Amino acid sequence: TKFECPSRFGYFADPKDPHKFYICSNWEAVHKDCPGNTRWNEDEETCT
C-alpha cells in the first residue's frame, strides 16, 4: 500500500473506507478489514 504510516507502530483509520484500517509496524502498513459490520473507532483503537 501507498498509505503512509504516521508512526513507526500503531493502528490507523483508512480514510477511504470506515470498514477498514491499517496496522503499522516499523513504518510498514498492512491493510485490514473490520469484522462483520463494525467500523474503525479512533478513540477505542479497534472496530466497534
Added chain:
Amino acid sequence: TKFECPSRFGYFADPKDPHKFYICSNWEAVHKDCPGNTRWNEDEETCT
C-alpha cells in the same frame, strides 16, 4: 507472575492470549491489545 521483559526494548507475545502482546521500553512492560480480530504475529512483531 508479572511479565518480565526479555530485552530493554521489544515487542513480545502474550502466552495467555493470542490477541494481546507486551511492549518493553527500558525493561518496563505495557500490555496491549491487537485491533479487530487480529492476533499477535511474533515473527513479524505485529498484529495480523
